[model samples]
Target: ITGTSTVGVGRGVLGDQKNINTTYSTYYYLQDNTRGNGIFTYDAKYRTTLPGSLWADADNQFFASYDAPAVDAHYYAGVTYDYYKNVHNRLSYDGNNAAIRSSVHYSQGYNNAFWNGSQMVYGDGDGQTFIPLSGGIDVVAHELTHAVTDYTAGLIYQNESGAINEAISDIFGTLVEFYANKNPDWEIGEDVYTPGISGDSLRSMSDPAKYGDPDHYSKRYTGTQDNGGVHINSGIINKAAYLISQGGTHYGVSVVGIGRDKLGKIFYRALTQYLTPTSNFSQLRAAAVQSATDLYGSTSQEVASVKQAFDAVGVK
Candidate 1:
């Protein structure tokens, strides 16, 4: 819809007050025109249909109980967009300023979220497992990062390649969480997962085993479930990423901390320039090592740490 760019005040699912960019014609709509092409959010209205109507408000004030999910989805999409543009110099998920879009309240009792190869879709959980998923910045960023991966590496969403794809989303999701500086942690989906449980998350990049995920390649799941354990096996790469940034000793292997910024740089380079659709765990190691070498020299500690992180995770 065409309208003048405007701003709206809203209260998120977490009850935090924030300002969201909107578009105003006859009514205010959650179509942010300030970032890239635009960030459009829609209402799924507890149905399965995608990208429902553009969220419209009569007064440009989104404080209603039902408006909470849309508020967070729209706001967090903008934050994720800013992270890519400012931190990585990428215009948007496609590196060409693609319009970001999201839909909230996807279905009744649907406790999940995903990138449907086109737009972000968030489910209003059963209130036990989750609330509104878009309320979590990491969740929103994680889904958006899938879009980024599809446009770049095009990694196959199965087997080792799929795990790498999942881990990439987790890595950038955590980074975006840190970028936003709002209760940042190395855990994924802590804010929106299990509203009743404290100190828990969907997965832990720092310690994947906390949720029974394998942190070492030898313990990787070989089952065919979950697209060859994409989510389950991502722990191996997630642990390596954590070790690359924070440094840790695992199974007699030790890595020197290279910090988050350098970690992000190396991974971003690898994802954009080296990783392929069929790249496996070993290939990912080589890509990260080469990426670090390219950014920080062959003999630099960054490269060494990249090698050590993979070694610590038994990737090689």
Candidate 2:
């Protein structure tokens, strides 16, 4: 028990009395690798010479994948952490000392990705289309936001409640990605999708209309694909959040979006305090706008933009 503190596997990195692990490297790989990482789901074949361990390396000999200049997964996670900390004035994951946990390269050739109640998992695309659902920082933020949603809204995952739940994740995910300094023109699945396709990702906040779809929700909007299009229908909500604080039209291209961090602040507040598990789209729309009003003012530019964005999404 001498070097006992440095006993973690995977990255086994020691930091501030914690082992950060290598989820960041694996997450980036899954995001950009055209051929996929040949791994998915964070199914680490871990080994522990001790009693308790966070994650295992499974089998080493894996690449760190490509880097997005200076940004990475941990970069996004840390940004999100700070966003919540300052915006919500709360600590990490738990109000106490609960640190966030993430896992990467979960399964072999796993096409989709998800956040299991506690940890996040990524899948390696099946080569033809998506590589792995790992690379994007927003994606990680998106999954983590699911945890936030669960902690806050506790939005029911069915009917309109499910839609609201899904929407909240997309809203925060997009904001988180932007907070990470990705870009207004950022696409969600840039690394997951295959060549010359639809530019990756299921939706776009900056240009939801260009995807050959109606920019706003309609009664005729088919609600069947991707789990009620949670991934696809999320487009409208994602676009609305961008338009709300930034000031823009959901139908046409976004005119101007809010400061990435600013947007995250408003939404996170609404999600954590104002809403509940049984919330619907309309209810969520009101909650976030109310949060904006309370934080800044009822007539603040952010409040106005937030309303406009939600209205555009047909959340009225």
Candidate 3:
């Protein structure tokens, strides 16, 4: 079906009014056919499947609570897409202008979201730990970055490589949040996680040790649970990335801040051009060093900062 470019006004899950991209076929709809084949938002209706149903509307004005999650899921995806295209000069997740698709309300009381190796899937959350996963721009970008990782490094999702994969997602996700300039912070999922709690987040890149996550290699969880502690150990790399961007002292090691843009460029180059499926922590440090060297010369402070940041986390 053909679609006419249009705009939409809607309230998100957190009750924020915002404008979103849309298309009008026979009726004004939620499908945004602007970027690539556009971003498609779907309703899982509390089921566990994918690409559920194309969200449709009449006036493209969604104000009901039931429509809130879909609005955010669609809008945030667009923002993530734009971050890649405009900032990174890449098309979409696959770097080939691939159609981005997302499904919300997946599974009853679902508290997590994932890439599932293809389209993005989100949940309404248990309402205790979260409201809606889509409500967090960082969370949305985090999942989408998994797809980007899939296409680029193909990092195996276990052990140190898996931790690298998770860290990459967190790194880029935070970058995209900063790119959107929506109350940007170095914390992940603070906007949507634990609404009842104030000044808390699922993870903190600046201080990953704040939430029982390891910020140094010596503290890494070398267990078999949680996929070799992928989520737990990612903090080590997350902390390094944060220090590279903001300059911090950790365990007596000091780093000079290089800013977010340079940090993003270096990491993006490493992931796309240097990382591999089984790249471990040592390999990651090398990849980041080479990436920074490539972007800012071997003798540049950017390269030195990359090494310093990783060393602060004991990745040397």
Candidate 4:
């Protein structure tokens, strides 16, 4: 959209107020030009659609109740962009300053969100399982990180590789959440998972077993469902990442914490420089160890913690 860059105030699905990027001409459109190329958010209008329409409001301001998801989606995308560029020195998802785009209110009573290869799509939820998913920054970052993974490692979306793909998204998403310093925790979708529930989230990185997910490699699901348990088995790698960042004892194995910054550096390097599309858990372990060695040398505590965290998760 051609217009002057501007800012607008709006409330998210959870009633939290925030400023969002918009474009002002005769009307305000949810398009942020201050980011990389741009971040354009659209309203899907509760139907099965692609990018429905560019969100627009009168008076160059947005505070309507229904404009909540669009507001959050737009704002959160900017935060994720900043996290990647400022922390990792990467431009956009592609490391090429790619334009980020997202759409909200995808379908009536829908309850999920995903990165559809090119852009982000979010469902308004059935109001039982979830609210508007974009309300959670972790969720927003999680989806966007999928695009990052796709561009870098290109991890195949099946079996162990697929689990690695999912875990990478969770790992970086949590990092982004912490980078923003907004009530950060090692949990995903805590803010908007179940509207009526508290202290519960869609997934837990500290202890994936809390939600019936396997925190150990031995407990991995080998079933054919869910693209060979991509989401289910991701718990293993998620636990490893948690151990790397926070340190923990799992299955009688203990890991010394290395903190989030080093953890992110190691894993980001692994993903961008060492991993392949077919990389599995064992390969991920090797990649992380090599990445840590590259950044902090083979004898550094960072390398030792990476190895210990992978071992603690039974990745071997």
Candidate 5:
């Protein structure tokens, strides 16, 4: 939609007031023209359609209960975009300023979200397992990072490669959460998961086993379910990432903390330059080590920490 770009006041699913980018034509539409080509959000209307009607508000004020999901989706998409552009100097998910788009309220009690290879889609949960997924910044960033991975590494989403792909999303998702400075933590999807439960998340980077995920390679799931345990096995890599940044001992292995910025740089470099579609756990270790060496020199502590982190996770 072509129109003057403007800002609209809205209340999100969490009942927090925020300003969202909107396009002002006859009515305010959830088409943010300020970032990249644009960030367009749509209403799925409790249906299974893709990008169903463009969200339009008569007064440019989104406060209705039904508008909560769209508000968070549009706002959080912009935040994730800013994170990439400002922190990593990447234009967008494609590194070419691709227009970001999303659809909220995808279905009745859908309880999930995904990239769909084209646009982001969020489901309104059953109110027990989840609420509006877009309300969680990590959830939104996690889905968007899949788009980034598709454009860059193109990692095959199965077996070890799939686990690597999932961990990459989680790593960047947590980084983006920290970048936005919104109650940053190593937990994933804590804000939008199980509104009834406290101190819980979909997964934990600091301690993957808290949710029964394997933090060591030897305990990895070899089952064929979940695309060869993509989500289940990601814990190994996630723990390594956590160790790289925070420095902890796991199974008699200790890693020196290298902090989050360097952790992000090394991983981002590996994802963009060294990783391949079929890279496995060992290959990921090599890539991260090489990436750290590239950014911080072969003798740098960053490189040593990368090696130690993978060792701590039993990757090598």
Candidate 6:
């Protein structure tokens, strides 16, 4: 059973937003051994005389009120840190305890968020329709996940590898939203964008063809959007994972199959223990399948279901 947090927007939307959610736990004990840095931006001249905390910087420029950014960044960091802790069971991204650093107010009206080699960065949204980048929980998690992806398969940001990298972020990002107590209907960016935008969500895990015309499998996919629409293409993978975890079917006609809890255990083991950089599709898929075989036995439907689920997403 999933532990629900009733906290609305404060203690993580799980227990209740009014609940206190800040923590010095991970950074204090896991510092430098795990990467727990919070919202950060590369400002060539930005520096803080106040002091650096686990999540936000009091000294960074563009942090107008100082209170909101720090508070928000702190909660965001806690959420991301706690997610890696609770869900993945890894200390942090590296498992070696890395210093957690976050910088805010990256550039004037910056619309995107990203993680560089050393730290995570946030932009205070365009403001016309968006707020600061740290305004969204998934945005922060999604950026930090770039670091996680780099540590894991180190999938190159091009073609299939790029597609995989983007997909990985969406997986954790969506999970982060759920972790933070947002709706779980499989939509992205809907919470942050201004109104009048019908499809604020970039992709839907339940249906891939919604945002843009996409098929389960086919080269009919003529990349037309950002970064060759890697973000858009990730929908297929999302659908595969979502339905499988819920023990449901996906696509049409015979659809895709899944086996509930066993599937999660295998995927988790594969991601944490066996998967590695330079690992391609074949290596990655095999690792998970092998993990399911070992954990639930070769004859288990769980193992078979994973393979079928992956294939059902048009993995071929």
Clashing pairs in 1: none
Give the per-residue lDDT digits (tens) of candidate 1, residues 48-162: 9988998989999999999999999999999999999999999999999999999999989989999999999999999999999999999999999999999999999999999
Q: Against the correct fold, how does model 4 do in TM-score? A: 0.98
lDDT of 4 by residue, 49-127 (tens): 7888988899655567788888889988999999999999999999999999999999888889999988999998888
- Model 3 Cα lDDT, one tens digit per residue, 186-205: 99999889989999999999
Write down the lDDT of every candidate, Cα atoms only.
Answer: 0.95, 0.55, 0.92, 0.91, 0.95, 0.56
Give per-model TM-scores: 0.99, 0.72, 0.98, 0.98, 0.99, 0.73
Residue 163 accuracy (lDDT) in model 1:
99
Q: Residue 315, candidate 4: how far off, in angstroms?
A: 1.0
Backbone collisions counted per model? 0, 18, 0, 0, 0, 27
lDDT of 4: 0.91
Clashing pairs in 5: none
Better of 1 and 3 by lDDT: 1
**Tens-digit lDDT track for model 5 on 287-310?**
999999888999999999999999
> lDDT of candidate 6 vs native?
0.56
- Per residue, candidate 2 scores C-alpha lDDT tens digits across 190-287 of 54466447455555666666564345667314566645555555666666766765576555544445666667778778878888887766787888
Stretches of candidate 3 exceeding 4 Å from the true structure: none
Roughly what TM-score does model 5 have, to 2 decimal places? 0.99
Tell how far residue 171 is off in model 3, in angstroms: 0.8
Per-residue C-alpha lDDT of model 6 across residues 82-172, encoded as one tens digit per residue:
7877867766677654545556656666666677766776666676566555666776777777877777667767545566576667767
Better of 2 and 3 by lDDT: 3
